[PDB]
């Protein structure tokens, strides 16, 4: 708004252009599980992934681009990007960054058990200081880690939410006073009562139902990867009306009938592009080439 404006920075995991030691030093002797994404790779956009474990960090190579990465096609080179997106790493290939980091939601990762974005370190210029809240959560496992920025969780201990710095880790305080972040797929979501009330805000000049633009506030209305093993939901994927009509084959059975108009959510995302969605309460797998996929696509992304 003022003479400064912004974009992301204080959004979630992404890290800044780590010179060279930052991305390695900051991820070195870190927690038993940690990963980070710095900007220093080929293509139009930077894609890398360093993971800690025991002996130095493990930087991984990743590929990506602006075009839509729903399913792996056979194109040549995107107009804006440098070449076909598609992700890479350890003889692997996903489609989206958030889709990649979303590996611990199912079962461990390349190295260690359930990793997460590293603290800040590497000498940061920005410090968090927000007073956001929501309903509180309880720890379902013992406490233990390495990074001071995060907050170890002690079984049966109740933690109050204060902000969402990651897609798999929210910020909460411990019964000792210490502040930090707790895991999403390790605690139990608890809903007391004083969570969905807000102030008021009100309106001024309305008439019709607006579109889901901007993005809802973090909380019960929209929480990070809590039930999504693959599909992302940092602020809310594309939810409106199918862009193209794609019906199921006659020889099909448990297939989904997709038609431009209705609204479908991405329920269950496979590796080779074929994902399943919810349309008219029906759950089935459609080509998905007639719908606007989800992952890491933002209008004002400014990736390139």
The residues near 196 (Cβ < 8 Å, ≥ 6 apart) are 219, 220, 221
The residues near 187 (Cβ < 8 Å, ≥ 6 apart) are 137, 138, 139, 140, 153, 159
Cβ(50)–Cβ(57) under 8 Å? Answer: yes
Secondary element (H or E) of residue 52: strand 48-54
**Does the 126-195 domain belong in CATH 2.30.30.40?**
yes
Cβ(48)–Cβ(62) under 8 Å? Answer: yes
Q: How many CB atoms lie within 10 A of CB 189?
A: 13
- Which two three-digit tokens encode residue 72? 């792996």
Cα 142–161–277 angle (5° rounding)? 90
Cβ(113)–Cβ(33) under 8 Å? Answer: yes
DSSP state of 159: E
Please give the full DSSP string across 172-226, using - where no structure is assigned: EE-TTS-EEEEESTTEEE---STTS-------SS--S---S-S-PPSBTTB-SSS
Cβ(116)–Cβ(104) under 8 Å? Answer: yes
Distances (CA, A) of 215 to 15, 32, 172, 212, 233: 22, 33, 22, 7, 10
- Which two three-digit tokens encode residue 180? 């930090």
Secondary element (H or E) of residue 31: none
Q: How far apart are CA 15 and CA 9, in angstroms?
A: 8
Q: How far apart are CA 259 and CA 247, in angstroms?
A: 6
Q: How far apart are CA 93 and CA 99, in angstroms?
A: 10
Report the SS3 class of residue 170: strand
Buried b (16+ CB within 10 A) or exposed e, 107-124: eebebbebbbbbbbbbee
User: Where is the chain broken, named by the residue before each break, C–N > 2.5 Å?
Assistant: none
Cβ(174)–Cβ(154) under 8 Å? Answer: yes
Give the residue range(s) of CATH 2.30.30.40 domains in the chain. 126-195, 196-286
Residues facing 262 on adjacent strands: 260
DSSP state of 249: P
The structural architecture, per CATH, of the domain 20-125 is 2-Layer Sandwich (3.30)
For residues 89, 73, 296, 241, the Cα torsion angle rounded to the nearest 10 degrees is: -150
DSSP state of 269: E
The residues near 233 (Cβ < 8 Å, ≥ 6 apart) are 167, 222, 223, 224, 225, 294
- Which two three-digit tokens encode residue 107? 């079962």
Give the residue range(s) of CATH 3.30.505.10 domains in the chain. 20-125
Technique that determined the structure: NMR
Cβ(139)–Cβ(148) under 8 Å? Answer: no
Q: Hey, what CATH topology would domain 196-286 get?
A: SH3 type barrels. (2.30.30)
Q: How far apart are CA 123 and CA 265, in angstroms?
A: 40
Q: How far apart are CA 30 and CA 61, in angstroms?
A: 20
Task: Provide the CB-side half-sphere exposure for 261 (13 A, CA).
Answer: 6
């Amino acid at each position: 708004m003022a003479g400064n404006f912004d974009s992301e920075e204080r959004s979630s995991w992404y890290w800044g252009r780590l010179s060279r030691q930052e991305a390695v030093a900051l991820l070195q002797g870190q927690r038993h599980g940690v990963f980070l994404v710095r900007d220093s790779s080929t293509s139009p956009g930077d894609y890398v992934l360093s993971v800690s474990e025991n002996s130095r960090v493990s930087h991984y190579i990743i590929n990506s681009s602006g075009p839509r990465p729903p399913v792996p096609p056979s194109p040549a080179q995107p107009p804006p990007g440098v070449s076909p997106s598609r992700l890479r790493i350890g003889d692997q290939e996903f489609d989206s960054l958030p889709a990649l980091l979303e590996f611990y939601k199912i079962h461990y990762l390349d190295t260690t058990t359930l990793i997460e974005p590293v603290s800040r370190s590497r000498q940061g210029s920005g410090v968090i200081l927000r007073q956001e809240e929501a309903e509180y959560v309880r720890a379902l496992f013992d406490f233990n880690g390495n990074d001071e920025e995060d907050l170890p969780f002690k079984k049966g201990d109740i933690l109050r939410i204060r902000d969402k710095p990651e897609e798999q880790w929210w910020n909460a305080e411990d019964s000792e006073g210490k502040r930090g972040m707790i895991p999403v797929p390790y605690v139990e979501k608890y809903r007391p009562a004083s969570a969905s009330v807000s102030a008021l805000i009100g309106g001024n000049q309305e008439g019709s139902h607006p579109q889901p633009l901007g993005g809802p506030e973090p909380g019960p209305y929209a929480q990070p990867s809590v039930n999504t093993p693959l599909p992302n939901l940092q602020n809310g994927p594309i939810y409106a009306r199918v862009i193209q009509k794609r019906v199921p084959n006659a020889y099909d059975k448990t297939a989904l009938a997709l038609e431009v108009g209705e609204l479908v959510k991405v329920t269950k995302i496979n590796v080779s592009g074929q994902w399943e969605g919810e349309c008219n309460g029906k759950r089935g797998h459609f080509p998905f080439t007639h719908v606007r996929l989800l992952d890491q696509q933002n209008p004002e992304e400014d990736f390139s």
